[PDB]
Design a protein around this ligand. Structure first.
Ligand SMILES: Nc1ncnc2c1ncn2[C@@H]1O[C@H](COP(=O)(O)O)[C@@H](O)[C@H]1O
Ligand SMILES: Nc1ncnc2c1ncn2[C@@H]1O[C@H](COP(=O)(O)O)[C@@H](O)[C@H]1O
Ligand SMILES: Nc1ncnc2c1ncn2[C@@H]1O[C@H](COP(=O)(O)O)[C@@H](O)[C@H]1O
Lengths: 314, 292
């Protein structure tokens, strides 16, 4: 029951402390019929000074600001994330790393003041857009926005649902825009899990085999989402593409158990929300994770971007 | 769901405060011993809530808890569970500056800046003493001490275990020191004094052997601390005027004593000891008390 907020860096402990603290407060705050325009200009601020006390893991002094907390609670509900689960993923053990919760469910990115600014501008429209699509979207699902202060330095963070599966392993990833001229630098290509780009993707004849029912529901999301990004005049985002090779993982698992001594391709679509199985007619048995990232030629992109993503599938 | 709904925002800040600090403490490992820094420690939290959660709480306020490790240890030495303490302050607004939790278990006195300084002054020796008497004493049992800042105004408070039962009711008080005013002598709860008590030649029939042995070591300890002006709060519950009458849980009503057989319930403890002849006040109080 006892949380120590132990982390490799103080910032992280403060993060764990803040999510823990703010989620508990929300738990005493009745759940509103609807949201109100002020909820979109609201915030919580807490400043801690702990003298000669409770300093094993937390600094004596820090600040924690949560943006628009009523809105993000409701956003969580819409995306079917229970506050307690969220709270636990962040607090049970330090996030890892751009961070991930220890259980790989939530991404936590550090962002700009301008990003936080941009979140506010698009927030009323984004909330409404999440409602009229019932949370069915390739877009980032935003769960919280925070400003931490440690040693008088301010850090902004945005929490999202993870694109990749919290269990299944990604063996190959791309970041796609659709033009110009994009590839992975010999630097990247020589990393463990290179972020490949379009020309890399096109250049390798890469195709994803998902089957018609899935392809249609995916393309119908992509269409609505990217029109929304066009309306909001947003630009330069990407389609994160993760590929899981089922047989490869099973072998990797087997090699993992043998070493220790000295089911495959399955995922819960309620948790691994961006994941699609490969069509039974696929070369390899694969699992794909696809979503739009980095939303923080306007109507052009919409078309440029959309036509491309549409050609990845079969 | 805890709303911290209360008449005064200061009562809401208090409920929020006790709730927050008790939760925080539940993530703090209980140490093998208190350290000298624990007697110089505090928690401070400043809250600034724009357009949020303002139904019962102010939007801006401060809450400071003095020496939280020491007072949590004091709670344990007084056999009070943290979560019960939290529940008592927090489920419903403290009641009736002098307060009790809605369930009558704990008293909440506003005090002065100098009181808080006096408490810091005596705390180590007060702790050492509670350790030594194994919690058995008529002194006030200090459970927490706090400073609230609301509308830019600081308020200090000291939480104690109640003298009077939180169940059984009282029909007569006494404030013995070794008399009552007119406008007072009309109150529903008449706070009599030594003279009123002698006047009616009353003497609680009792135990008195141990009770007095206790009261003695207590007042000798107040003496060595050069403290004075404290009284003995005495309560009287009429039996005659589910649960039976005269029935109480000694582990909760810790000061309560049922009347002897040969006589025609008494609650008794020492109160108000943050006041500052000391050795002197001691015997006037002890010698006088040893009479009733
Ligand atoms: N309610 C708001 N509406 C629009 N922009 C905001 C709001 N709150 C903060 N920002 C912007 O977000 C960035 C960080 O804000 P601050 O929380 O004051 O550090 C700055 O660019 C602010 O102007
Ligand atoms: N929501 C997400 N889930 C998983 N990986 C991400 C997510 N967002 C970004 N990334 C990856 O993390 C890094 C951050 O992107 P960038 O904005 O280019 O620094 C890149 O390597 C991305 O491939
Ligand atoms: N069932 C299998 N499927 C694919 N590759 C395998 C399999 N078993 C062994 N290998 C590969 O054979 C090499 C030796 O494997 P091991 O038998 O674990 O020494 C490794 O490269 C394994 O990945």
């Amino acid at each position: 029951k006892v949380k120590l907020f132990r982390a490799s860096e103080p910032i992280l402990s403060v993060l764990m402390w803040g999510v823990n603290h703010t989620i508990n407060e929300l738990s005493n705050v009745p759940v509103p019929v609807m949201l109100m325009p002020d909820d979109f200009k609201a915030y919580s601020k807490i400043k801690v000074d702990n003298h000669l006390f409770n300093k094993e893991n937390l600094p004596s002094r820090f600040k924690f600001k949560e943006y628009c907390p009523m809105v993000f609670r409701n956003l969580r509900e819409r995306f079917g994330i229970d506050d307690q689960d969220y709270q636990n993923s962040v607090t049970r053990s330090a996030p890892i790393n751009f961070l991930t919760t220890y259980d790989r469910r939530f991404v936590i990115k550090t962002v700009s003041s301008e990003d936080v600014a941009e979140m506010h501008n698009i927030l009323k429209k984004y909330h409404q857009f999440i409602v009229e699509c019932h949370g069915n979207t390739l877009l980032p699902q935003f769960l919280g926005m925070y400003r931490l202060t440690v040693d008088g330095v301010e850090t902004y963070m945005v929490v999202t649902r993870a694109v990749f599966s919290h269990r299944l392993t990604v063996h190959r990833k791309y970041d796609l825009k659709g033009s110009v001229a994009r590839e992975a630098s010999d630097k990247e290509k020589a990393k463990d899990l290179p972020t490949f780009k379009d020309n890399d993707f096109l250049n390798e004849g890469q195709k994803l085999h998902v089957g018609e029912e899935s392809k249609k529901n995916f393309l119908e999301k992509l269409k609505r989402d990217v029109e929304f990004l066009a309306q909001l005049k947003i630009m330069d985002y990407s389609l994160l593409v993760g590929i899981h090779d089922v047989d490869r993982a099973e072998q990797e698992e087997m090699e993992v158990e043998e070493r220790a001594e000295d089911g495959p391709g399955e995922f819960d679509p309620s948790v691994d929300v961006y994941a699609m199985k490969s069509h039974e007619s696929s070369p390899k048995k694969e699992v794909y994770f696809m979503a739009i990232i980095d939303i923080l030629n306007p109507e052009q992109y919409s078309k440029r971007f959309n036509e491309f993503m549409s050609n990845i599938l079969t």
